């Protein structure tokens, strides 16, 4: 019976907090056993206990700094445009985790059934073990220098505007489907030969990075050969 607590939370709406609207929204979901909880755009500075039945919480565009425990059956979490300093435990049920536009410097352990991870515009310094189920990863606008080894089924990887200095190790063509990886504006000087073994399914943008003249010549010679059907590559 935290419904009274829900009311209390409302009574504690600091000037600007639209806690009442959320109170109604939360009550409705609880009474109707709803499955979608979105308290975004409510100027919330805190969040009351969440119903364990919900599997999708949308709380973006708010002034949150920490999040209550997440239902063990959650599958999608949207906390963008928040000042979150840390994210609570991730349920193995979670498949989508977007907390961009935050101040996260480290990330909790990632379930192995997660397919979407958006953690851009953060102060992340190191990323946790990446689950293979993840097909999309956005880690841009962060201060990362060492990307963890990429999973096998990684389709999109936007890892630009970071402090990366060394190119990452791939799955060695464990995936034969189209793949777009972005590594531009990162401080990389040299690259691995493993790249020479990747198919044209790979699309890589390394433009802006401080690559060495040697690699430039090499890669320029590679991109000027008809026999070369290697990965679509971009550089500058």
């Amino acid at each position: 019976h935290y419904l009274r607590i829900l009311t209390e939370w409302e009574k504690n709406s600091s000037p600007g907090e639209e806690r009442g609207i959320a109170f109604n929204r939360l009550s409705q979901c609880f009474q109707n056993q709803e499955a979608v909880l979105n308290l975004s755009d409510l100027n919330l500075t805190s969040l009351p206990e969440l119903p364990k039945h919900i599997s999708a919480l949308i709380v973006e565009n708010n002034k949150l700094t920490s999040l209550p425990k997440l239902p063990a059956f959650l599958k999608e979490l949207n906390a963008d445009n928040n000042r979150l300093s840390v994210i609570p435990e991730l349920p193995e049920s979670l498949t989508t985790l977007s907390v961009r536009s935050n101040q996260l410097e480290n990330l909790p352990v990632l379930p192995n059934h997660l397919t979407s991870l958006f953690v851009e515009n953060n102060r992340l310094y190191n990323l946790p073990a990446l689950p293979e189920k993840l097909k999309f990863l956005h880690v841009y606008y962060n201060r990362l220098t060492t990307l963890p080894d990429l999973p096998d089924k990684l389709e999109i990887l936007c890892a630009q505007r970071n402090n990366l200095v060394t190119f990452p190790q791939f799955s060695d063509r464990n995936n034969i489907r189209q793949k777009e990886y972005y590594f531009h504006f990162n401080q990389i000087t040299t690259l691995p030969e493993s790249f020479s073994q990747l198919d044209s399914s790979y699309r890589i943008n390394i433009s802006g990075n401080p690559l060495s003249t040697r690699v430039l010549q090499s890669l320029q010679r590679l991109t000027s050969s008809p026999d070369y059907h290697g990965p679509q590559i971009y550089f500058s």
Partner: protein, 324 residues
């Protein structure tokens, strides 16, 4: 032009030096949305893209027209993205400033089935005389009012769901200025004084007349296709200068003359300057000022929109002065 600034920023942060292309005018944005058609123009500075007002729906066999909407079922949203605006950009009405965008892509499976598909038996005259398709679109998720204090305060209100960047794929059915101008100048030096005069007499007609410019561009290209001097042509001496003494068309001459024309496209207001100069023989002076500004505000520019504009004036003035 500020719209272009934001669009270019989006492209740089998302895919710098990549298939991504930027929307140059906010009015023609909705026409660059996915499944739309975009055509290419001849511009030496680089391939330019213009809207068509047509969509793959208008050319494909709709299987009846009773339900053309099912195609959109092939449209996928990779999700949303964030672009950190620079310092000169301010979201009027937050020390770190960023904008939120949405990515829409056409399913690869529909891209595969595209080639193995039938067009409508009846097609628009535009498509009938058509002889690419937008594949990805990054659009605004909400209204964004931005302002810039950059110089070479402007304000732009981008309505929501407005395409900012776009990637296109070919539609199929069942380079350094210094080098360029050098090459062109060389091609022209291998020409008689009389012939060069003829070319000049024409290119001077092209000054200040987009009508004459398009006409002479079309005609140079036409006699480059046919390769035969027409019996009579209103600009016959130009195309005559295109052919050598043996009459064998030196394709370099035409390509370059077209290139000069392509550049002249980039100079709308400045054109008067060049014309007055050619009318007074001050061209040499103008060439120098262009060179000074280029060298002064740019280190090894021949290694800003103005930069491209300047390179054009150099090319145009250089060629003209070389003909005279």
């Amino acid at each position: 032009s500020v719209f272009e600034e934001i669009t270019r920023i989006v492209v740089k942060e998302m895919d710098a030096g990549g298939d991504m292309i930027a929307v140059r005018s906010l009015v023609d944005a909705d026409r660059f949305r996915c499944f739309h058609l975009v055509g290419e123009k001849r511009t030496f500075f680089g391939c330019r893209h213009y809207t068509t007002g047509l969509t793959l729906m208008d050319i494909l066999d709709t299987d009846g027209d009773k339900a053309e909407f099912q195609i959109l079922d092939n449209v996928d949203s990779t999700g949303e993205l964030i672009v950190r605006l620079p310092k000169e950009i301010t979201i009027s009405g937050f020390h770190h400033q960023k904008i939120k965008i949405s990515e829409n892509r056409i399913s690869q499976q529909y891209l595969a089935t595209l080639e193995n598909r039938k067009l409508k038996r009846e097609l628009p005259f535009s498509f009938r005389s058509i002889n690419y398709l937008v594949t990805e679109t990054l659009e605004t998720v909400k209204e964004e009012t931005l302002k810039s204090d950059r110089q070479y305060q402007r304000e732009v209100t981008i309505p929501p769901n407005r395409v900012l960047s776009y990637r296109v794929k070919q539609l199929v059915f069942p380079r350094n200025m210094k080098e360029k101008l050098e090459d062109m100048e060389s091609v022209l030096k291998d020409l008689t004084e009389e012939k060069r005069k003829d070319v000049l007499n024409s290119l001077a007609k092209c000054l200040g007349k987009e009508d004459i410019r398009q006409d002479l561009e079309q005609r140079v290209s036409e006699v480059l296709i046919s390769g035969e001097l027409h019996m009579e042509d209103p600009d016959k001496p130009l195309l005559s200068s295109l052919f050598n003494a043996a009459g064998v068309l030196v394709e370099a001459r035409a390509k370059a003359i077209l290139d000069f024309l392509d550049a002249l496209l980039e100079l709308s207001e400045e054109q008067q300057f060049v014309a007055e100069a050619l009318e007074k023989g001050t061209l040499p002076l103008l060439k120098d000022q262009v060179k000074s500004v280029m060298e002064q505000n740019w280190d090894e520019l021949a290694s800003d929109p103005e930069a491209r504009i300047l390179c054009a004036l150099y090319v145009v003035v250089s060629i003209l002065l070389e003909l005279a």
